[PDB]
């Protein structure tokens, strides 16, 4: 019903309230439609962003690690998604 950015806009407003549970699902909801292609000026690593941080405070640890190597994937200059990546494989992958 809302475009991806009203979308994105609503995940946004969710995790500056420090509700990261909303946050998630807003930010889930707009990869699923950037994925069928619906045009957006937000691109997936913002989204990819804003959602591991929300589902890694939810304590949903492999889950957060997945988005985290992903984000970096579509951002590799991103260096504090790089310090969360090393920080999670040290943590979870041994």
Same mark, same amino acid.
């Given at each position: 019903?809302?475009?991806?950015?009203?979308?994105?806009?609503?995940?946004?407003? +969710?995790?500056?309230?420090?509700?990261?549970? $909303?946050?998630? %699902?807003?930010?889930?909801?707009? *990869?699923?439609? !950037? /994925?069928?292609?619906?045009?957006?000026?937000?691109?997936?690593?913002?989204?990819?962003?804003?959602?591991?941080? +929300?589902?890694?405070?939810?304590?949903?640890? $492999?889950?957060? %690690?997945?988005?985290?190597?992903? *984000?970096?994937? !579509? /951002?590799?200059?991103?260096?504090?998604?790089?310090?969360?990546?090393?920080?999670?494989?040290?943590?979870?992958?041994?």
């Amino acid at each position: 019903m809302l475009s991806v950015d009203d979308c994105f806009g609503m995940g946004r407003s +969710a995790y500056n309230e420090g509700d990261y549970y $909303h946050t998630v %699902l807003w930010m889930e909801q707009v *990869l699923k439609q !950037l /994925d069928a292609g619906e045009e957006a000026t937000t691109t997936k690593s913002q989204v990819l962003d804003y959602l591991s941080y +929300a589902v890694f405070q939810l304590g949903d640890l $492999h889950r957060a %690690l997945e988005l985290t190597r992903r *984000l970096l994937s !579509l /951002d590799p200059s991103h260096e504090r998604a790089g310090g969360n990546l090393r920080y999670f494989e040290q943590l979870l992958e041994e």
